[PDB]
C-alpha cells in the first residue's frame, strides 16, 4: 500500500513509520551501532505495529505486511532495559523471554522480534 | 519511479564549507527517513547523520557541531550543511531514503567532496 510499499492495515504502516526513535544502518545512537544493513526501531513502536496490524479489519494484507516484516531472519528491535542476562525460551529461532539483572542500570539494548 | 540526486559536492580549502543537496521524488519525500553516508578514499561506506520525517536528527561522532542535516519537504530537497571541512571529510557523500515499514532504501549515486590541505 502507499504507506507499506486496504485502509487499515495501510494506517498501521503510517504510525509505524513515524517511529520516533530509529536507527539506521550502520547509524550509531544510544551507544549501540545498527549492524543490519535496514533502519532498526524502539520495541515500542515494533510492539504498537504487532499489536495493529493483529487487530486490524484488512485481515489479508495485515498477514502479509506482518509476516514480511516480522518473520524475516535476525529481526531486531532497540530498547532501555537492565542488562540481559539469558534468554528463558526460544522457539523456531527466536526469543520469547529473556532475563535481566535486576541491580544494575539500565542501557540500551537489542531484543528480538517476534513472528508474526 | 524513485530518482535522487545529489548536488553540492567539489573542491574546497580545510576549514571551509559545502552545502549538499538532494532532490528527490516528490511524490515520496515527506514520508521517507533520510540519511546521509559517505565513502572515504579506500574504505566502504559508512553512516553520518539520519533525519526523522517530524525533522530529528542525530548524527556521527566525527561530524557533530560541524554539520547539519536538514529536510526541507515543500522542495522534496534533503540538505547537508558541512563547516570546518577537515581533509578526512574528503569522501563520495550518498543520500538515502528510508522506508521503514517496507525496509526499502533508496540510494543517489553520490556526489564527490574534496578537501585540500
Known amino acids: 500500500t502507499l504507506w507499506c510499499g486496504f485502509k487499515h492495515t495501510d494506517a498501521c504502516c503510517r504510525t509505524h513509520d513515524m517511529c520516533p526513535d530509529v536507527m539506521s544502518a550502520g547509524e550509531s545512537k544510544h551507544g549501540l551501532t545498527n549492524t543490519a544493513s535496514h533502519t532498526r526501531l524502539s520495541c515500542d513502536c515494533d510492539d504498537k505495529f504487532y499489536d495493529c496490524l493483529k487487530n486490524s479489519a484488512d485481515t489479508i494484507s495485515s498477514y502479509f505486511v506482518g509476516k514480511m516484516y516480522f518473520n524475516l531472519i535476525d529481526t531486531k528491535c532497540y530498547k532501555l532495559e537492565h542488562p540481559v542476562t539469558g534468554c528463558g525460551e526460544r522457539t523456531e529461532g527466536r526469543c520469547l523471554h529473556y532475563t535481566v539483572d535486576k541491580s544494575k542500570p539500565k542501557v540500551y539494548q537489542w531484543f528480538d522480534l517476534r513472528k508474526y | 519511479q524513485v530518482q535522487l540526486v545529489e548536488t553540492g559536492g567539489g573542491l574546497v580549502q580545510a576549514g571551509g564549507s559545502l552545502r549538499l543537496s538532494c532532490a528527490t521524488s516528490?511524490?515520496?519525500?515527506?514520508?521517507?527517513?533520510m540519511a546521509w553516508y559517505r565513502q572515504t578514499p579506500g574504505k566502504q561506506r559508512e553512516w553520518v547523520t539520519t533525519?526523522?520525517?517530524?525533522?530529528?536528527?542525530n548524527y556521527a561522532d566525527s561530524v557533530k557541531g560541524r554539520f547539519t542535516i536538514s529536510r526541507d519537504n515543500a522542495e522534496s530537497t534533503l540538505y547537508l550543511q558541512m563547516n570546518s571541512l577537515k581533509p578526512e571529510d574528503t569522501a563520495v557523500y550518498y543520500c538515502n531514503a528510508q522506508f521503514l515499514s517496507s525496509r526499502t532504501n533508496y540510494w543517489g549515486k553520490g556526489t564527490q567532496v574534496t578537501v585540500s590541505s
Open positions: 516528490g511524490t515520496i519525500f515527506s514520508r521517507a527517513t
Open positions: 533525519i526523522t520525517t517530524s525533522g530529528n536528527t
